[PDB]
Amino acid sequence: AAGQSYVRNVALALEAQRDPSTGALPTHLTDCLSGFGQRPKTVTACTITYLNALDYVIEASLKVVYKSSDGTLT
Amino acid sequence: ANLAAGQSYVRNVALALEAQRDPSTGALPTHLTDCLSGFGQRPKTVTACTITYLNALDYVIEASLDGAALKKVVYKSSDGTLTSLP
Amino acid sequence: ANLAAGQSYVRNVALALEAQRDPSTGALPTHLTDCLSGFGQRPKTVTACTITYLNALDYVIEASLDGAALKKVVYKSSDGTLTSLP
């Protein structure tokens, strides 16, 4: 699971793009097939869902799910 | 670069805490409230460091710096913000 | 003096990272991979900043600058080199 590591790196990248005073994420960035460095070929689908301006869920098919709100990876 | 050494230490404490979450529930061990020790090398500019748990998922790190461009750093896990104050 | 401001920022990132080394082993925490925050005041010329760890001791900082005499600056801890105009 090179896929898991990629997902964690997408999350880290998203954390770095938060507004530094409010925490808000740009909520139109919903694709993580590109724009997050080298993607291992095992990752065939990657979407970011924003639940509000702070919280996101990354879903990747290789299925793995990262939730920013609780920091869990499944 | 004391302010930078302090801030970066705080970010490293947060990353360490993230790694210690329960992998199914996300819960943190909420008795770990001191960050003066237990998080690797602490730059000497950091003279106070406390972690406050607002619930089982969310924490706030507060650090005080000596001889730095600012005095207090606060990191909030819930919104991912880092603030620094004189 | 944007190139100078970006260069100065990168050097401050490096100095901050040095402060986090274990003083017996030299090892750094290797999950702090961006330097857009947590390293003091960042000049607005610095639009991207990443830290790559090549092993537990050695890192490379890459920063992208806009409106500067160079576009990218790179610091390597192993050789202490920083992009400089000849």
Residue numbers in the entry:
A (entry chain C): 41 to 102, 109 to 120
B (entry chain B), C (entry chain A): 38 to 123
Give verbatim lines from the article.
Tt122238-123 adopts a typical pilin-like fold, with a central α-helix packed against a 4-stranded antiparallel β-sheet. There is a trimer in the asymmetric unit, with two Tt122238-123 molecules (chains A and B) aligned approximately parallel and a third (chain C) bound in the opposite orientation. Analysis of crystallographic packing by PISA highlighted the interaction between chains A and B as significantly larger than other interfaces, with a buried surface area of 600 Å2, 10 inter-chain hydrogen bonds, 4 salt bridges and a Complexation Significance Score (CSS) score of 0.4. Chain A is transformed onto B by a rotation of 138° and translation of 16.5 Å, possibly indicative of an interaction preserved in fibre assembly. However, such an inference should be treated with caution, given that we observed Tt122238-123 to be monomeric by size exclusion chromatography (SEC; not shown). Given the potential involvement of Tt122238-123 in natural competence, it is interesting that a closely related structure, as judged by r.m.s.d. after superposition, was ComP from N. meningitidis. The ComP fold is more extensive than Tt122238-123, with an additional β-strand (β5) and a loop which wraps around the back of the β-sheet (shown in red in Fig2e). Tt122238-123 therefore appears to lack a specific structural feature, the DD region, necessary for recognition of DNA. Furthermore, calculation of electrostatic surfaces for Tt122238-123 did not reveal a distribution of positive charge which would be characteristic of nucleic acid binding, as noted for ComP. The modeling indicated that the structure of Tt122238-123 could be incorporated into the pilus fibre model, although some repacking of the core helices would be required to satisfy steric constraints (not shown).
